[PDB]
Amino acid sequence: TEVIKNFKKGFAATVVPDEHVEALDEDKLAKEAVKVKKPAP
């Protein structure tokens, strides 16, 4: 047990993937708006 623990002392075991997905079309990302009635386009 002593040997095993002294060995585990020095033992060395072996980020997000890309998913290669293409960007959403900005025209399909809806935007919550405040429908004001003032004339100022």
Binding site: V15, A23, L24, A30, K31, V34, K35, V36, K38, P39
Partner: protein, 288 residues
């Protein structure tokens, strides 16, 4: 031998599965009715708060943090709305596809996605990919209350006003026409000031107590919360519709599997009888 035994075992297994999936489909139908009821029940408050927000924005200072976009956008907090239970179809998978499209849109503009999840399925999907989930909410996907939406919206708006995000998005399944469960990405913050028209000409002046800007800034986070709640309800109804469709599909599949397994079992039964007769007659002819 022992092949007919395993075939009959698989047959009774598939029969149990078929019964369970049929029951689950009918239960999902009843609960779809319930969820549509809750959605059309929450509709009126949404309409009225939208109208009041419009009346307030008509005569307010439109420079609220939730209303102006920020130069140097570095981070967008995305809230992914998935389910807790899993007997739905591609519901969660469609949500995750839409969320990945949104993440790859946000990395194109230099923003860093900050991820909030609703549901255990999104928790699994994002922990498997070594994501960093700032906050998670679970247990109210099939019947969300306004208090859950209030908590979520408060956390999101606190992150927005502040370790800080410059945009706020929601990826959830929109429910329409009882036939369209479509994963969609919405931008809830910052809102965009859109001018429709004077509409009515000269009309009566609206009184504001104490003034329009105070009420506007008091209503803006309330409107965020109302929209989060509507998104939660739509996603719940969509999850129930997806579960009904998926359980009907699984019932048809278990039916076809029972049919094929029964054909194989009858073949093995006939073959066993023929082989036994061959052995008996072989012995009898050897002795004759």
């Amino acid at each position: 031998a022992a092949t007919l035994r395993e075939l009959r075992g698989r047959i009774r297994s598939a029969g149990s599965i078929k019964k369970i999936t049929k029951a689950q489909e009918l239960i999902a139908t009843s609960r779809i009715a319930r969820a549509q009821a809750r959605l059309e029940s929450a509709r009126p408050y949404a309409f009225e708060i939208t109208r009041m927000l419009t009346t307030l924005a008509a005569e307010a200072a439109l420079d609220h943090p939730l209303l102006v976009e920020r130069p140097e956008p570095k981070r967008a907090g995305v809230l992914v709305v998935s389910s807790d239970r899993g007997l739905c179809g591609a519901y969660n998978a469609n949500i995750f596809r839409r969320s990945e499209e949104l993440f790859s849109l946000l990395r194109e503009a230099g923003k860093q996605p900050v991820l909030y999840v609703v549901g255990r399925k999104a928790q699994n999907y994002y922990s498997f990919r070594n994501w960093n989930i700032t906050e998670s909410w679970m247990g109210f996907s099939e019947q969300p209350t306004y208090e859950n939406a209030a908590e979520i919206a408060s956390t999101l708006v606190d992150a927005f006003l502040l370790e800080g995000v410059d945009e706020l998005h929601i990826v959830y399944t929109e429910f329409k026409s009882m036939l369209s469960q479509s994963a969609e990405a919405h931008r809830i913050a910052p809102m965009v000031v859109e001018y429709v028209e004077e509409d009515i000409g000269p009309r009566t002046l609206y009184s504001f107590e104490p003034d329009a800007t105070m009420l506007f800034e008091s209503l803006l986070p309330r409107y965020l919360t109302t929209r989060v709640y509507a998104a939660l309800l739509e996603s719940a109804a969509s999850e129930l519709a997806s579960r009904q469709r998926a359980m009907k599909s699984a019932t048809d599949n278990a039916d076809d599997l029972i049919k094929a397994l029964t054909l194989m079992a009858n073949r093995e039964r006939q073959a066993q009888i023929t082989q036994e007769i061959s052995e008996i007659v072989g012995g009898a002819n050897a002795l004759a």
